[PDB]
Amino acid sequence: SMLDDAKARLRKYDIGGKYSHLPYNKYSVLLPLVAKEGKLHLLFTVRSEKLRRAPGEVCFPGGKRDPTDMDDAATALREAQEEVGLRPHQVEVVCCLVPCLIDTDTLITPFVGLIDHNFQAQPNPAEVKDVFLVPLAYFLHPQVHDQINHIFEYTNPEDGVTYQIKGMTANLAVLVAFIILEKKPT
Ligand SMILES: O=C(Cc1ccccc1)Nc1ccon1
């Protein structure tokens, strides 16, 4: 099936806990996969305008590890619950992808999660201005704008709203799209 095929592809790229004990300032992100209308989508947040760093930017749910977290996956799930109301029973964490090194002292670990079809986002307005879906196949043929570095513009056909996706967020979306959709029969 579509979902069994996606999980099987994703498991081949799982690094597991290999880099998780290293002495960095630690953050985790959740790459949330949603199945609608017979296709896979990624769920994104728009950060509240009130926030100190990167107000109004498109991001994945996530944040800083705290002492309560049993592991890096737990960080991603705690932050996702706080930000968009995603409960643990509504997500299956399938794997841990390549971590992102930044600032010389910081390691950001991404986890891909399959999201339950009965989940409905409840944006917490102190942290998140908006939540939206992009079809995973978009990241194979994105509408690119050069700012000089590459920015994706996605327009939601439901309402005509345009979102800008860039940086680590755009990079990870492309990675997930390649892993799941490369070399598939029609
Ligand atoms: O902050 C994140 C993810 C993140 C954290 C740290 C480093 C890179 C990415 N997601 C949010 C926060 C509010 O709305 N979305």
UniProtKB/Swiss-Prot annotation:
Residues annotated with N6-succinyllysine modification: K7
> Main localisation, per the record?
other
Query: Which Gene Ontology CC terms are recorded?
Result: cytosol; peroxisomal matrix; peroxisome
- Where can the motif Nudix box be found? 64-85
One Gene Ontology term of the molecular function aspect: manganese ion binding
Activity control, as annotated, is: Inhibited by fluoride.
Q: Which residues of this UniProt protein bind Mg(2+)?
A: E79, E83
State where the protein is found. Answer: Peroxisome
Q: Which domain of life is it from?
A: Eukaryota
**Swiss-Prot/TrEMBL GO biological process terms:** acetyl-CoA catabolic process; brown fat cell differentiation; butyryl-CoA catabolic process; coenzyme A catabolic process; malonyl-CoA catabolic process; medium-chain fatty-acyl-CoA catabolic process; nucleoside diphosphate metabolic process; propionyl-CoA catabolic process
User: Tissue expression, per UniProt?
Assistant: Expressed in liver, kidney, pancreas, pituitary, small intestine, spleen, heart and placenta. Weakly expressed in brain.
Q: Provide the site residues for: Important for coenzyme A binding.
A: R53
- Name the protein family: Belongs to the Nudix hydrolase family. PCD1 subfamily.
Subunit record text? Monomer.
Function statement:
Fatty acyl-coenzyme A (CoA) diphosphatase that hydrolyzes fatty acyl-CoA to yield acyl-4'-phosphopantetheine and adenosine 3',5'-bisphosphate. Cleaves CoA, CoA esters and oxidized CoA with similar efficiencies. Preferentially hydrolyzes medium-chain acyl-CoAs and bile acid-CoAs. Has no activity toward NDP-sugars, CDP-alcohols, (deoxy)nucleoside 5'-triphosphates, nucleoside 5'-di or monophosphates, diadenosine polyphosphates, NAD, NADH, NADP, NADPH or thymidine-5'-monophospho-p-nitrophenyl ester.
Question: Protein name, please?
Answer: Peroxisomal coenzyme A diphosphatase NUDT7
Q: Which gene encodes it?
A: NUDT7
- Residue numbers of the full-length protein present here: 14 to 209 of 238
